[PDB]
Amino acid sequence: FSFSPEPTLEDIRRLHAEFAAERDWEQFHQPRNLLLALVGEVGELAELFQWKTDGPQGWSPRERAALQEELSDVLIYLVALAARCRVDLPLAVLSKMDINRRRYP
Amino acid sequence: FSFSPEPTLEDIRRLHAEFAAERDWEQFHQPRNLLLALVGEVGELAELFQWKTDGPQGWSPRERAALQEELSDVLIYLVALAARCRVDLPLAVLSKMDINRRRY
Amino acid sequence: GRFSFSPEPTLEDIRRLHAEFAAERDWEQFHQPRNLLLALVGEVGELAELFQWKTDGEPGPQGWSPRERAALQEELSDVLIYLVALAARCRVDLPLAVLSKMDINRRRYP
Amino acid sequence: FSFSPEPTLEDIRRLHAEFAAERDWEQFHQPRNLLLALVGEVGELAELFQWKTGPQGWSPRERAALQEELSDVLIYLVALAARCRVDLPLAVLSKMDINRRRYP
Numbered sequence: 415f416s417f418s419p420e421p422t423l424e425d426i427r428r429l430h431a432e433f434a435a436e437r438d439w440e441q442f443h444q445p446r447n448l449l450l451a452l453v454g455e456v457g458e459l460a461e462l463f464q465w466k467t468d469g470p471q472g473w474s475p476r477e478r479a480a481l482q483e484e485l486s487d488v489l490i491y492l493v494a495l496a497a498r499c500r501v502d503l504p505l506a507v508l509s510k511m512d513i514n515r516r517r518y519p
Numbered sequence: 520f521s522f523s524p525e526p527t528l529e530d531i532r533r534l535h536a537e538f539a540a541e542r543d544w545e546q547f548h549q550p551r552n553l554l555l556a557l558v559g560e561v562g563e564l565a566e567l568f569q570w571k572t573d574g575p576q577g578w579s580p581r582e583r584a585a586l587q588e589e590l591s592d593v594l595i596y597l598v599a600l601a602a603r604c605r606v607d608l609p610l611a612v613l614s615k616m617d618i619n620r621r622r623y
Numbered sequence: 624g625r626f627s628f629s630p631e632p633t634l635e636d637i638r639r640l641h642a643e644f645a646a647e648r649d650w651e652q653f654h655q656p657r658n659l660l661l662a663l664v665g666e667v668g669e670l671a672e673l674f675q676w677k678t679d680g681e682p683g684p685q686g687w688s689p690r691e692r693a694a695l696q697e698e699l700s701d702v703l704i705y706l707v708a709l710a711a712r713c714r715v716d717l718p719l720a721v722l723s724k725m726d727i728n729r730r731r732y733p
Numbered sequence: 734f735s736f737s738p739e740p741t742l743e744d745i746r747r748l749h750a751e752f753a754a755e756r757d758w759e760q761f762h763q764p765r766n767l768l769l770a771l772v773g774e775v776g777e778l779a780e781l782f783q784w785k786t787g788p789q790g791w792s793p794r795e796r797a798a799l800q801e802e803l804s805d806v807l808i809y810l811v812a813l814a815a816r817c818r819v820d821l822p823l824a825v826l827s828k829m830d831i832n833r834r835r836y837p
C-alpha cells in the first residue's frame with residue numbers, strides 16, 4: 415500500500431491559503447482558533463471509531479468515505495495551524511524522524 | 520511564507536512504516552491505538568496554548584521547539600493512521616477541498 | 624447571591640441514571656472502556672466546535688445566543704456523562720479520586 | 734460498583750474556586766483557557782489507553798495515573814461550566830431527557 419504522489423503538503427498549504435483568502439477567512443485563523451478547529455475535527459474522526467473495537471480496510475466504501483473526509487479535515491487544519499505559526503512542517507517531520515532513530519536505536 | 524517541497528505525505532508514510540517494522544512496532548499500530556496516540560499529541564499541543572490568553576511567530580526558542588515537534592507527531596500519527604486504514608490521504612484531501620468549495 | 628450549582632444529581636446519581644438508560648436499551652455491551660473514552664473525545668470535540676471562532680472577551684459564553692447556550696449546556700453535559708461512564712467502567716470512585724487529586728494539587732502548588 | 738456519595742459537583746466547584754482564589758488564579762481562567770486545559774487532560778487520559786489494544790488488570794501505578802487524569806478532566810470541566818454560568822447538574826438532567834427522545 416501507498417499514497418498518491420500529489421498533493422504534497424505544500425500543495426495543501428497553498429490550496430487552503432488561497433481558499434481562505436478568497437473568502438476573507440484569514441482574519442479568523444488565529445492559532446488558538448485553528449487549534450480548537452483541529453480538536454473538533456479530531457472529535458469527528460473519533461466518533462467514527464467509538465463503537466468499533468479493533469478486529470477500516472474492511473469497512474464499506476460509504477463509511478470509508480466518511481473516514482476519508484474526517485482524516486482530510488484533520489490534515490487541513492493541522493497544515494493551516496502549522497503555516498499560521500510559520501513552521502515548515504515537512505522539515506519539522508524530518509527533524510522528528512531523525513530524533514526518533516537516535517532515541518530508539 | 521511556504522513549506523519545503525519534501526518529504527511528501529508518501530515519503531512520510533514510508534519512513535515511518537520502515538521505522539516501525541524495523542522495531543516490530545507494527546503490532547501496536549492498530550487503527551484505534553494510532554487514533555488515541557493522535558489524540559494524546561493534540562492534547563500536548565493544547566497544553567502549549569492553554570494559558571496563552573488571546574503570537575507563536577515570536578515565541579521563545581524552547582516553545583517553538585516544542586511546537587514544531589508536537590505538530591510533527593500529530594502529522595506522523597495521522598499519516599500512519601490513514602495508511603493503516605488503507606486511505607489515500609492526498610487524494611482524499613483533494614476530494615474534501617472540492618466539497619469545501621461546493622459548500623462555500 | 625453568587626453563582627452555584629444545583630445539589631443533585633450528584634456523580635453517583637449520574638452513574639445510576641446513565642446505567643439505567645443503557646440497561647433500558649441493552650447497550651452496556653458496547654460500553655468497553657476504550658469505546659467510552661473515544662465517545663468522550665468526540666464530545667470534547669463538539670464542545671471545542673462551539674468555541675473555535677469565538678475569541679475570548681467579555682461578556683463571553685454568558686452573552687451567547689439562546690441556541691448557542693443550549694448547545695454549550697448539552698455539550699458540557701455530554702462530556703460529563705461519558706466521563707462518569709468511563710470512570711464507572713474502570714472501577715474508579717470518581718468523587719474520592721477528586722479529593723485525592725485536590726490534595727496532590729495542594730502539595731504541588733502550596 | 735458505585736461511587737461514594739461526596740463530594741458532589743457543587744462541592745467540587747467550591748473546592749476548586751477557593752483553591753484558585755487563594756492563589757489569585759481566577760484571572761487566568763477564561764473559558765477558552767479552561768477548555769484547552771481540559772483538552773490537554775483528555776489527551777493525557779488518551780495516552781494511558783493508546784497502546785492498550787482491561788483497566789482493572791493494570792498495575793497500581795497505571796491505576797493511580799488513571800484516577801488522577803479522570804479527576805483532572807472533571808475539575809477543568811467543572812471549572813469551565815462554572816465560568817460559563819452553566820448549572821451543570823441540571824443541564825445533565827435536561828440532556829438525559831434529550832437522549833431519551835433521541836433514542837426512544
Ligand SMILES: CC(C)[C@]12O[C@H]1[C@@H]1O[C@]13[C@]1(O[C@H]1C[C@H]1C4=C(CC[C@@]13C)C(=O)OC4)[C@@H]2O
Pocket residue numbers: 439442676
Ligand atoms: C458568526 C457565525 C454565524 C459564524 O460561524 C462563525 C465564523 O465566521 C465563520 C462562519 O461562517 C461560517 C464558516 C466559518 C469557516 C471558517 C472561518 C470562520 C467561519 C467563516 C473556516 O475555517 O472554515 C469554515 C459563521 O459566519
Ligand SMILES: CC(C)[C@]12O[C@H]1[C@@H]1O[C@]13[C@]1(O[C@H]1C[C@H]1C4=C(CC[C@@]13C)C(=O)OC4)[C@@H]2O
Pocket residue numbers: 465650653
Ligand atoms: C452500526 C452503527 C451504524 C451503529 O452506531 C453504532 C453503535 O451501535 C450503536 C448505533 O446505534 C447507534 C447509537 C449507539 C449508542 C450507544 C451505544 C452503541 C450505539 C447503540 C450509546 O452509548 O449511545 C448511543 C448504530 O447501530
Ligand SMILES: CC(C)[C@]12O[C@H]1[C@@H]1O[C@]13[C@]1(O[C@H]1C[C@H]1C4=C(CC[C@@]13C)C(=O)OC4)[C@@H]2O
Pocket residue numbers: 544547784
Ligand atoms: C509495554 C509498555 C511499557 C510500552 O508502552 C507500550 C508500547 O510498546 C510501546 C512502549 O515502548 C514504548 C514506545 C511505543 C512507541 C510506539 C509504539 C508502541 C510503543 C512501542 C510509537 O509509535 O511511538 C513510540 C512501551 O514498551
Ligand SMILES: CC(C)[C@]12O[C@H]1[C@@H]1O[C@]13[C@]1(O[C@H]1C[C@H]1C4=C(CC[C@@]13C)C(=O)OC4)[C@@H]2O
Pocket residue numbers: 570758761
Ligand atoms: C507564564 C507561564 C510559565 C505560566 O503557565 C502560565 C500560567 O500562569 C500559570 C503558570 O504558573 C503556572 C500554573 C498555572 C495553573 C493554573 C492557572 C494559570 C497558571 C497559574 C491552573 O489552573 O492550574 C495550574 C505559569 O506562570
Ligand SMILES: [Mg+2]
Pocket residue numbers: 455458483484487
Ligand atoms: Mg469534518
Ligand SMILES: [Mg+2]
Pocket residue numbers: 560563588589592
Ligand atoms: Mg510529542
Ligand SMILES: [Mg+2]
Pocket residue numbers: 666669697698701
Ligand atoms: Mg453531543
Ligand SMILES: [Mg+2]
Pocket residue numbers: 774777801802805
Ligand atoms: Mg494531568
